[PDB]
RNA sequence: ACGGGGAAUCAGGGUUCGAUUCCGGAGAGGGAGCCUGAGAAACGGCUACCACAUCCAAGGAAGGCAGCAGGCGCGCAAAUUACCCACUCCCGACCCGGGGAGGUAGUGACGAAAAAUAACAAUACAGGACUCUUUCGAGGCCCUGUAAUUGGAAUGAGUCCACUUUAAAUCCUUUAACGAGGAUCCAUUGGAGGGCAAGUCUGGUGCCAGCAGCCGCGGUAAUUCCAGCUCCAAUAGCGUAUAUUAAAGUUGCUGCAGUUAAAAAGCUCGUAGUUGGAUCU
């Protein structure tokens, strides 16, 4: 019908800048930190709630 | 450690006879001529176009 | 016509189910216990045992006095005993089916450096091997996945040209000595 | 509450999410 | 039931190779009419000249206008409507442009909502659409 | 559709690929005819015709990259107009000459193998677990961190003498000297409703823009679009398209089905085919 509205929402969206953050980790040390975060000093916590990226 | 190969000849003239020339050139006992290989091939093909004693007068 | 050889072979196999919980957890546990770089290092050792078990599954179907079962059944046992994964007294062909991944992962040079007291974690040992601090009898080894044999195990040391061994001190100690 | 969420939303758009949250609550983890 | 005897090998294999033609996947890939109707001619990608931008209307249980492109192929002169994926990617496309067209995923069938469109755009003016969309490259002048 | 040796996939049975370095065949633009020779119907030999095409003083003369490079075209789709006979072999009258066969470099994320992007110690935690304390709270007891907390220790990537390598070189290996703290010497590609690991957090949009292989999401509270933040998977790799194999017991020999889901011939005869009762030490 009409090609006039195209790129509408991507152009209408307020361009928020990417905030800076530190370097992540790579390789053996990244696998090390995600092994620690899951199998040693995992928090003894609420039952069955281990649903990480749990936003409430 | 390092591992190579060596040969020990009887005389020096036996060494000059029974050696690859690239190893004689590594001691300065042989000098290869300094023309390239594209020059020799084009000079060989330029003098096939020419009969008898004018072959030596080909540049 | 070139004078080359195009024989090559893959060392690992990807699993059929890409996102299967309780496979990811088990492989991450195996990484963390041994300090591997990625999941392909785990799948590489799953692949060698799966070939060893396939080789022993077919010898167990032949006749018990067959010459191939007696000959290749004894070479296959000798190699597992030699690299320390089997026991000496367990040299029947049926104990190959009772081998596990961790029995092979124990025999990496990285875990042997950690378990012989040369390092103080499984991550200090990989980084010790990779920057040329460990040797095996005369020969500096760079490779963390070096499968140590049972007779070449007590000849693991600190590689005489290293600061932890014979000891010309390193680039950092030398500069700090020059500074003050 | 995953039980109440499941019993309210099992027919709606969010049925698979509340099913997954109920199964997470039930089977440990 | 089926014949089972020791000398039935000719009856068994001539029946299987005649009942193999009643399968849709065998008839498609062993007859030759479906390959002569495929505008790519069996290729994975192709190249054409953009003739016009075209808005195609979505099928009934949802509603939008999908931003397609009518493109005439270079190698055989067949015409094709092809879908331009992300938003504001029809803005990147002029007319009479070199364009690179792939399949759309279901091997000759129309992917879900867009009616009768088997193809999608990958490059425009020898720049990929993903490089233009994420702002890695610009259209040449 | 060049054929095999073979390749991928695979419980077992299978299915698909093999132009391609080994062997065999064929053909040097299209057909045809020959000379020489032990051997050719030879094309880096000749003679015609057909199609193209070059030089010309217009009379004439010359041609054949499906060899190595290279160019144009075609296309989704593919590298240097490089060095050398040192190696492997071949040819010649020949220990000596020649070899775009072949070797060596270049380009090379087709693909395959190894393998960095940090390690450790000391502090601090209204961390955690472990020994005592009813509990508070006590420990060099052991681990963790999203501490740009403190600390010097270890290294390669690089820069770069020299040797070694090689025909000569390069690369690798070996060694000088320099080379790390936000070790800014910065890891990416795809995702986050389900299938399928991982956020009904936040703002924008308002059946629009778009997403979505499929089911679906979007109509003013969007778990699905566009972004931020966080998290997930594989990792120097990871998406997409197409061919193909498994999944497919959805081609069924192993091993399917035919009342109602797709399906058994109107009936009997009847050739080939297929299958055929006991019985001989």
Strands E79-83, E127-128: pairing is unpaired
Give the residue from A43, A48, A51, A54 with the most D CB atoms within 10 Å of its CB, the best one to mutate. Answer: A48
d(C-alpha C113, C-alpha C129), whole Å? 8
d(C-alpha E121, C-alpha E124), whole Å? 8
Nearest to C52 by CA among C68, C73, C34: C73
d(C-alpha B19, C-alpha B13), whole Å? 10
Nearest to C49 by CA among C65, C71, C64, C30: C30
Q: Where are the domains of chain E?
A: 1-141
E106 within 8 A of E113, measured Cβ to Cβ: no
d(C-alpha C86, C-alpha C152), whole Å? 16
Helix C67-82 with C40-59: angle, nearest 10 deg: 150
What is the DSSP track for B25-56?
Answer: GGGTS-------SHHHHHHHHHSTTS-GGGGT
Cβ distance D26 to A48 less than 8 Å, yes or no, reads yes
Neighbours of C122 (CB within 10 A): 20
d(C-alpha E88, C-alpha E102), whole Å? 19
Q: Protein B1 CA to nucleic acid F171 C1', in Å?
A: 21
* Given resolution (angstroms): 3.0
E81 within 8 A of E119, measured Cβ to Cβ: yes
Cβ contacts of A36 on chain C, cutoff 8 Å: 32
């Amino acid at each position: 019908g009409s090609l006039a509205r195209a790129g509408k929402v991507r152009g209408q969206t307020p361009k928020v800048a990417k905030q800076e953050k530190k370097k992540k980790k790579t390789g053996r040390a990244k696998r090390r930190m995600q092994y620690n975060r899951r199998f040693v000093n995992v928090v003894p916590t609420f039952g069955k709630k281990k649903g990480p990226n749990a936003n409430s | 450690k390092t591992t190579g190969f060596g040969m020990i000849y009887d005389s020096l003239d036996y060494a000059k006879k029974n050696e690859p020339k690239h190893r004689l050139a590594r001691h300065g006992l042989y000098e290869k001529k300094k023309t390239s290989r594209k020059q020799r091939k084009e000079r060989k093909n330029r003098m096939k176009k020419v009969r008898g004693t004018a072959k030596a007068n080909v540049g | 016509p070139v004078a080359r050889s195009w024989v090559c072979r893959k060392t690992y196999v990807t699993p059929r189910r890409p996102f299967e919980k309780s496979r990811l957890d088990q492989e991450l546990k195996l990484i963390g216990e041994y300090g591997l770089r990625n999941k392909r290092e785990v799948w590489r050792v799953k692949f060698t045992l799966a070939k060893i078990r396939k080789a022993a599954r077919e010898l167990l179907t032949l006749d018990e006095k067959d010459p191939r079962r007696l000959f290749e059944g004894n070479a296959l046992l000798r190699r597992l005993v030699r690299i320390g994964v089997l026991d000496e007294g367990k040299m029947k062909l049926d104990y190959i089916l009772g081998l596990k991944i961790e029995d092979f992962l124990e025999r990496r040079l990285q875990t042997q450096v950690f378990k012989l007291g040369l390092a103080k974690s499984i991550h200090h040992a990989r980084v010790l091997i990779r920057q040329r601090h460990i040797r095996v009898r005369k020969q500096v080894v760079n490779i963390p996945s070096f499968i140590v044999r049972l007779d070449s195990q007590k000849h693991i040391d600190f590689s005489l040209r290293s600061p932890y061994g014979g000891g010309r001190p390193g680039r950092v100690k030398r500069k700090n000595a020059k500074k003050g | 509450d995953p039980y109440e969420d499941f019993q309210e939303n099992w027919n709606t758009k969010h049925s698979s999410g509340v099913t997954r949250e109920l199964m997470r609550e039930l089977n440990g983890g | 039931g089926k014949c089972r005897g020791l000398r039935t090998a000719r009856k068994l294999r001539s029946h299987r190779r005649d009942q193999k033609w009643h399968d849709k996947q065998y008839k498609k890939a062993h007859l030759g009419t479906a390959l002569k109707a495929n505008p790519f001619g069996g290729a994975s990608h192709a190249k054409g000249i953009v003739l016009e931008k075209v808005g195609v209307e979505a099928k009934q249980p949802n509603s939008a206008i999908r931003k397609c492109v009518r493109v005439q192929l270079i190698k055989n002169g067949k015409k094709i409507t092809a879908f331009v994926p992300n938003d504001g990617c029809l803005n990147f496309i002029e007319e009479n442009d070199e364009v690179l067209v792939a399949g759309f995923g279901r091997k000759g069938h129309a992917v879900g909502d867009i009616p009768g469109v088997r193809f999608k755009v990958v490059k425009v003016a020898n720049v990929s659409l993903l490089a233009l969309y994420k702002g890695k490259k610009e259209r040449p002048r």
